[PDB]
From a paper:
To further explore species-specific differences, we assembled chimeric POLγ complexes using mouse POLγA with human POLγB (mAhB) and vice versa (hAmB), then analyzed their conformations by cryo-EM. While R conformers resembled their wild-type counterparts, E conformers revealed key distinctions. The mAhB complex adopted both human-like and mouse-like E conformations, showing that human POLγB can induce a human-like conformation, but the accessory subunit alone does not dictate species differences. Overall, hPOLγA, when paired with mPOLγB, adopts a conformation more similar to the complete mouse enzyme (mAmB), whereas mPOLγA remains partially resistant to structural influence from hPOLγB during proofreading. Strikingly, mPolγA paired with hPOLγB exhibited a reduced kcat compared to the complete mouse holoenzyme, while hPOLγA combined with mPolγB showed a modest but steady increase in activity.
Residue numbers in the entry:
A (entry chain C): 66 to 138, 178 to 218, 230 to 354, 369 to 482
B (entry chain A): 50 to 230, 246 to 299, 326 to 480, 508 to 608, 626 to 644, 709 to 971, 1026 to 1211
C (entry chain B): 66 to 137, 177 to 218, 229 to 359, 362 to 484
DNA sequence: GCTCCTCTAGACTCGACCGC
DNA sequence: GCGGTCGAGTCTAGAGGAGCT
């Protein structure tokens, strides 16, 4: 439990002092910040969510909801991404040409008071016609559960449950199984039309839809998933101290290094391979620049704690026959291959998983 | 009573200097001469004008040996030129053995004693050598082999890159990769042979001077540009038998007259590779030896003749000092090259992008056949090739239904792939785009395909159509039988009405038009096709309106991109902004820079606080020809040209990159209207023997640039043209240009002037300045009379030094021909004599008072010196003293034993760390937008006057 | 300029009502929000900035600066993200093993008082250089940033620059853009000294030591803070080509010529008449094919209604749509689909199997 | 007031493939 | 068996120098 947090702190996943970072601050959005590896992991999670939710769908669109709400109600920071999305209902109705159903998705920070607490959340609002509200709710629940279980090493820990609110609206909530207990990471609510009627008192003419030929008032659906809490869950999922993150999420994938001398001769080869890999969108850790070359086993341990898919070693032979050591993090098996075959193999490994 | 004057109320020299230079007593002015000068001034309304006297300078000049200052200069020159003539004479009486049987194959120098015996030596142990060095161009520019002849032996040198075939040598030149040579090194174009000598790149001046047979040839028997053209065309021709070109073979033919020189047709040094040189060693060495012996014979037959035609030793000492030029450069030169080439490529790519964008917007005129109304795109090909085919909400899908839908879409998509069989084997190329657009866009199958019309360039005949170029508001047009040429409206059918509307819009925003001719043979409906003015004459057709000849026309606003967009004029301005680099990148980027190692630098530079252990300092020794024309002025295209950093030129700050090493400062100053004051003083000496007697000389002396009283300002006010145009006008007319030159200048500068108007204006301008016919009743009549009298004399010689005109220009051989060239030569060779006097006096001052400094460069009339940091003020005072003495000598040789104070000292002696024209410029260019003070770290420089110099130096050159 | 904002609202680049949008609101940061196409353009701009700066450099790292600024007796919303980056200097010196130069980068929101609080999305880069090469790194970054802002534009001359000096004597540069009304600041590079780090880290100064070569030294802090909201507004103003608006006297098409690496939606996919089922299947297959290769598509085939082809093309042009694919009935038998291009407005019938490769080649040829 | 040698880049041409 | 295209060859025009490699 504690060892994983220490590793994340040392490997620059969670920036801040050792005492400064606490579990409650992590879960309440009151942590000092994210380390560069944590920032890239969050960006990868955001990219994957954006793909799976907005990219391969023709009804979802991005949302630009500001942080402050300059409302007399003296402005306040936003607590939900839902209100900004609902402010765009009259605007984004024209994009789909008033054709129900349609959605609006956003990734952004929510200023939940605790001390100010900020969590980055990915929220989707689905303007369902009233007839099929529960059906689309189940559809989104199934898709979100499969997406959250896709990258996991054991979807058994990922779970789900039903619940009810004070109003009496059906809803399901997701709960990752953290080692200490079952903690929540996502929640789906089948809100009514009152969230839209309160913001638009009277004149329901502008709020109509085009379900079939009749015009209806869409029943919005709220699906909020805490991306930072998702990062925490996936980091706890991976955890020899090795964090076996999924290839599509890991921040650093390739560890380029040097072996025997001369340094000058191998520096050009390493830099060329580094540029080649970078141009293909594969992250590389520039370990060749390290003047004080540590032991190969120690370097491999550092890369294992850094969630690096493959470590590349360039030695004297590479200058002549182009053979480079390629260690696999998962199975700790060294192998050699031509330096021109590295890019294709890395792309294959990333795409396959 | 330091306030001396002139009978014309011109403030002359102070008594303290006038009694130390010209001696006491002087001469009582002739009352007749004073009366004539006063009457002449009254004729032009320049008599009695108040002039503010300058403060009188008190200074103690050093001892003048001999007296009269002429024997002084002669003694200085003789003391400077003695140890090198004592070696030239040793060479002229040599006993050189026959050529060696077989040239040795070893590194370094090998002394070939009697009977062609090879013996290795460390260095040539002689005080005189005729030199010729061969460098393989394939290997770069490092020297490969060299052959030199001593007064008593033959020598040869072979580099390590010709003896040892190493895997790879370094690409940076160093003194440890050059020829290891009072000494005299004769040669042909010895500047090329000098740049390959090791010791010539050290900061400390090794006392070695170079005699160039090419320079002596140009001094003795030289050819003007027209004479050179006639000589090349042929090979009234009496002068052809006495002159020759600068080729070593032609010079040897002219001076020796023996068998013609053998030039190897293999050209293994110019075209062949290093292996060819390694194989033909025994033949290339013999060819080089034959060239060396030809140079030796030319020198033998040339040295006495040059001395008999240029008797004053000042000329020879100045020529020896002009050979040793030195341009110190540092690591910022490589950065300058890189950031000029990158900024040239980026601007060229931006222009290409603008052209492609303007091409893309042109396709849309096809719809509705709107292109038939475009004045520029109406005559292109717009054909199109026909192609040759040969409910309610259903709800959420179930878990398997979505996969079923995806699979049934993917399989249906892949089923359409089977239709590729019907597709032709060779795909058609953009059948839907217009005809002119298919050519520009590359074929898809091409491996180097780029989106859009990627094959577009300024050279194509569509670019002046896309940009809608208008020449004085007239659209350009191309005809195959007459080249380019604009269309003047008012007279696929062309849209003449659209052209008329465009011209009306242009005239509102800013027959009747006369140009290269209506050319009714090319019938464009309702238009007149006037050709573009070509520089070669109206008998030739311009192939491209983007040629370098049209840049002034683009800047004047005549050739401008048409309206309707902001990408045409932007492309035109980008074209104007990269002309200099486009024309000079090969020259500037190929300069030979030898990076001196720290072991070769003096302790002054290696301990100065401005010295960093990660910087490289070099030396671009200019390959100058110390006598490059008939006028003996140095010629070097890269450096010795009128160049200065501009806000709209890429990589034009090269002269600002000549940065003195830490611990040294480039002291130097520019002469104020040297070639104008020389003509003025010649006229004054000829007319009445006093300064300001002629109205032209009086205007030159008592003239204020700010007040507009100067010559150029009055000329521009009278003719109503730009100041630069008036400056070129005045310099041309002074050099001897006739009225036809003035007419063509007026027609070129202003298109609204006809030939009649240009002739009238030229006649009116020449009838009040030069006078009437020799010449009488004009501002510059006496000066031109003196110049013509000097030119038409039996043996024209420069009045201030006695240097004779070239044999191919004396009036005996050329009878009544090339009068303009000789009258120009008078003034220009007088300026060259001025420069030689400056150099001799400066070297004397630097040697007697032990001022640590050396000559750097003499760009035009500028005179720079790489003086040590501590001796900058002493060097400035020395420059002022040398200018004073030079002007006094110029007046003394013309019979005027006096000198005006207003021209007796430098306006400002610039003291900076670069060769920028003024010490206040920041040299902001498209390549260097930040400025000198930020990109590199060069602060400004002092511009001390004479009074400020005296206080700093205490008035004494002694340390 | 008045028509450009109407186009941005209508084509959903800018949200809010027509009376609620003025250039003052856009520049101040108090606008109601950016339309979905504006959000996509801003994402593209941020991705290009990240590719230019963080991806290729071997030292630039990402950093996380919280929106709230706790303490000095309450909290406050952050105004600049520089102070957030300066706090990670000692933290991020371990990544480069105390080697210099190394930098930190971040893209985030900034709150600027205006009685209304505005917001701006600003991308910063705190670049800890040794004091020996401050005036070198500053000029290098000035050239790099000016090149980056100029390469995506239809008129790089508008993206000018200036060299203003600070009151205390520090040197710096301010980028600009020549909007129709005037020049507006979009990026600033201040060559700050070590004063900020010394003030933020009082006490023993051995922590603030970067191994420049072989000698330790307190680094010189360089801040490069660009405004991405005003950057994308400048790009929208530049692509519209207001100066262009004698040849275009009748030629008048309202087009946003955004750079292909910046345009929000790449291609528009349509359909014509019937059969409905097979054409829908073909369109969905092509949609998935293009999406799986990182090409955004506007699903124009889903529209139950139909508009005139010229009006549809004008709508796509105003939205910065590079290509307009039309899968007609004939595609089922030969695989030929019309392909209109935004740049030229000329139809080319390209085989459906070759569309993906051609689109990838066109997009990637513009440095993608 | 003008020539020449040589180099590259663009436009047009004649004569020969080869797809149908 | 026939007609549309593809590519070396020729003409033309601007580019540099009138040196030495
Ligand atoms: N149109 C010109 C200008 C100058 N020169 C020559 C003669 C001068 O001796 C030398 C330097 O002149 P500059 O033009 O550099 O400076 P000026 O003497 O003209 O002074 P200014 O430019 O201030 O008028 O160049 C020339 O031949 N033709
Ligand atoms: Ca020579
Ligand atoms: Ca001058």
């Amino acid at each position: 439990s504690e060892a994983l947090l220490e590793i994340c702190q040392r490997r620059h996943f969670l920036s801040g002092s050792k005492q400064q970072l606490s579990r409650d601050s992590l879960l309440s959005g009151c942590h000092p910040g994210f380390g560069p590896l944590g920032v890239e992991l969050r960006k990868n999670l955001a990219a994957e969510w954006w793909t799976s939710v907005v990219v391969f769908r023709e009804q979802v669109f991005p949302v630009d909801a500001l942080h402050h709400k300059p409302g007399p109600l003296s402005g306040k920071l936003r607590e939900n991404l839902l209100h900004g999305a609902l402010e765009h209902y009259v605007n984004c109705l024209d994009l789909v040409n008033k054709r129900l159903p349609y959605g609006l998705a956003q990734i952004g920070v929510c200023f939940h008071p605790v001390s100010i607490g900020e969590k980055t959340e990915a929220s989707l609002v689905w303007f369902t016609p009233p007839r099929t509200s529960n059906q689309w709710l189940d559809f989104w629940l199934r898709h979100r559960l499969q997406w959250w279980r896709k990258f996991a090493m054991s979807p058994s820990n990922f779970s789900s449950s039903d619940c009810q609110d004070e109003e009496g609206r059906k809803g399901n909530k997701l709960y990752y199984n953290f080692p200490w207990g079952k903690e929540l990471i996502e929640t789906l609510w089948n809100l009514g039309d009152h969230e839209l009627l309160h913001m638009y008192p009277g004149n329901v003419s502008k709020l109509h839809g085009r379900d079939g030929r009749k015009n209806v008032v869409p029943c919005v659906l709220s699906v909020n998933g805490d991306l930072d809490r998702g990062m925490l869950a996936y980091l706890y999922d991976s955890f020899r101290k090795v964090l076996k993150l999924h290839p599509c999420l890991a921040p650093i994938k390739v560890a380029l290094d040097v072996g025997r001398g001369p340094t000058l001769e191998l520096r050009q080869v390493c830099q060329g391979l580094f540029n080649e890999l970078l141009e293909n969108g594969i992250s590389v850790w520039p370990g060749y620049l390290e003047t004080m070359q540590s032991s190969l086993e120690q370097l491999y341990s550092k890369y294992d704690e850094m969630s690096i898919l493959f470590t590349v070693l360039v030695t004297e032979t590479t200058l002549e026959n182009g053979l480079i050591h390629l260690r696999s993090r998962d199975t700790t098996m060294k192998e050699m291959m031509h330096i021109s075959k590295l890019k294709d193999f890395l792309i294959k490994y990333i795409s396959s998983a | 009573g330091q306030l001396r004057l002139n009978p014309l109320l011109i403030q002359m020299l102070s008594r303290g200097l006038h009694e130390q230079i010209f001696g006491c007593g002087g001469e009582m002015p002739d009352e007749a001469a004073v009366q004539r000068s006063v009457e002449h001034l009254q004729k032009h309304g320049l008599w009695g004008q108040p002039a503010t006297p300058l403060p009188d300078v008190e200074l103690r000049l050093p001892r003048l040996f001999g007296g009269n200052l002429d024997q002084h200069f002669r003694l200085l020159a003789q003391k400077q030129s003695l140890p090198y003539l004592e070696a030239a004479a040793s060479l002229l009486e040599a006993q050189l053995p026959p050529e060696p049987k077989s040239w040795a194959w070893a590194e370094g120098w090998t002394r070939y004693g009697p009977e062609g015996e090879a013996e290795p030596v460390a260095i040539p142990e002689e005080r005189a050598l005729v030199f010729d060095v061969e460098v393989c161009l394939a290997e770069g520019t490092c020297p490969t082999l060299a052959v030199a002849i001593s007064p008593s032996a033959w020598y040869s040198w072979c580099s390590r890159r010709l003896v040892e075939e190493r895997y790879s040598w370094t690409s940076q030149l160093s003194p440890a990769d050059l020829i290891p040579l009072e000494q005299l090194v004769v040669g042909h174009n010895v500047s090329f042979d000098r740049a390959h000598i090791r010791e010539q790149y050290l900061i400390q001046d090794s006392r070695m001077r170079f005699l160039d047979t090419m320079s002596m040839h140009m001094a003795i028997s030289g050819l003007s540009s027209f004479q050179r053209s006639l000589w090349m065309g042929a090979k009234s021709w009496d002068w052809m038998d006495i002159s020759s070109a600068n080729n070593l073979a032609d010079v040897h033919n002219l001076y020796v007259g023996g068998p013609p020189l053998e030039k190897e047709p293999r050209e293994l040094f110019v075209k062949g590779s290093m292996r060819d040189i390694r194989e033909n060693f025994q033949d290339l060495m013999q060819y080089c030896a034959r060239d060396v012996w030809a140079t030796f014979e030319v020198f033998q037959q040339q040295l006495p003749l040059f001395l008999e035609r240029c008797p004053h030793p000042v000329t020879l000492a100045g020529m020896l000092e002009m050979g040793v030029s030195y341009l110190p450069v540092n690591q910022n030169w490589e950065r300058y090259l890189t950031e000029a080439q990158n900024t040239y490529e980026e601007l060229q790519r931006e222009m290409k992008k603008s052209l492609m964008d303007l091409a893309n917007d042109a396709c849309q005129l096809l719809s509705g056949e709107r292109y038939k109304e475009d004045p520029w795109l109406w005559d292109l090909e717009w054909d199109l090739q026909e192609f040759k085919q040969k409910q309610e909400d259903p709800g959420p899908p179930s878990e398997e239904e979505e996969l079923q839908r995806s699979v049934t879409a993917h399989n249906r998509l892949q089923q359409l792939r089977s239709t590729t069989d019907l597709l032709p084997k060779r795909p058609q190329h953009l059948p839907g785009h217009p005809g002119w657009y298919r050519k520009l866009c590359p074929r898809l199958d091409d491996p180097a395909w780029a989106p859009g019309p990627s094959l577009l360039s300024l050279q194509m005949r569509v670019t002046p159509k896309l940009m809608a170029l208008t020449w004085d508001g007239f659209p350009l047009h191309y005809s195959d039988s007459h080249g380019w040429g604009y269309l003047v409206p008012g007279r696929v059918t062309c849209p003449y009405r659209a052209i008329e509307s465009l011209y009306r819009k242009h005239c509102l925003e800013q027959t009747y038009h006369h140009g290269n001719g209506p050319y009714n043979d090319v019938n464009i409906p309702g238009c007149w096709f006037f050709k573009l003015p070509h520089k070669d004459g109206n008998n030739y057709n311009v192939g491209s309106p983007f040629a370098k000849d049209f840049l002034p026309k683009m800047e004047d606003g005549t050739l401008q991109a048409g309206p309707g967009g902001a990408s045409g004029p932007r492309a035109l301005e980008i074209n104007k902004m990269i002309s200099f680099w486009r024309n000079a990148h090969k020259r500037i980027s190929s300069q030979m820079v030898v990076w001196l190692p720290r072991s070769a630098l003096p302790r002054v530079v290696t301990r100065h606080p401005s010295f960093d252990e990660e910087g490289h300092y070099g030396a671009i020794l200019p390959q100058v020809v110390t006598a490059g024309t008939i006028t003996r002025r140095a010629v070097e295209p890269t450096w010795l040209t009128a160049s200065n950093a501009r806000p709209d030129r890429v990589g034009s700050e090269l002269k600002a990159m000549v940065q003195a090493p830490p611990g040294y400062v480039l002291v130097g100053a520019d002469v104020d209207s040297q070639e104008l004051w020389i003509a003025a003083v010649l006229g004054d000496a000829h007319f009445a023997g006093m300064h300001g007697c002629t109205a032209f000389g009086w205007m030159t002396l008592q003239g204020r640039k700010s007040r507009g009283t100067d010559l150029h300002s009055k000329t521009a006010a009278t003719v109503g043209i730009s100041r630069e145009h008036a400056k070129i006008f005045n310099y041309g007319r002074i050099y001897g240009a006739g009225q036809s030159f003035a007419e063509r200048l007026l027609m070129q500068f202003n298109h609204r002037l006809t030939r009649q108007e240009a002739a009238e204006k030229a006649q009116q301008m020449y009838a009040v300045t030069k006078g009437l016919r020799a010449w009488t009743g004009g501002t510059e009549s006496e000066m031109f009379n003196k110049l013509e009298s000097i030119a038409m004399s039996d043996t024209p010689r420069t009045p201030v030094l006695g240097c004779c005109i070239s044999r191919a220009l004396e009036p005996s051989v050329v009878q009544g021909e090339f009068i303009t060239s000789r009258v120009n030569w008078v003034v220009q060779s007088s300026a060259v004599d001025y420069l030689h006097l400056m150099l001799v006096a400066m070297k004397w001052l630097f040697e007697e008072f032990a001022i640590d400094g050396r000559f750097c460069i003499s760009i035009h009339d500028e005179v720079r010196y790489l003086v040590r940091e501590e001796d900058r003020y002493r060097a400035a005072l020395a420059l002022q003293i040398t200018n004073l003495l030079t002007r006094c000598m110029f007046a003394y040789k013309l019979g005027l034993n006096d000198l005006p104070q207003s021209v007796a000292f430098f306006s400002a002696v610039d003291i900076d760390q670069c060769l920028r024209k003024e010490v206040t410029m920041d040299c902001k260019t498209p390549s260097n937008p930040t400025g000198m003070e930020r990109r590199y770290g060069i602060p400004q420089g002092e511009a001390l006057d004479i009074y400020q110099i005296i206080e700093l130096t205490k008035g004494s050159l002694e340390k």
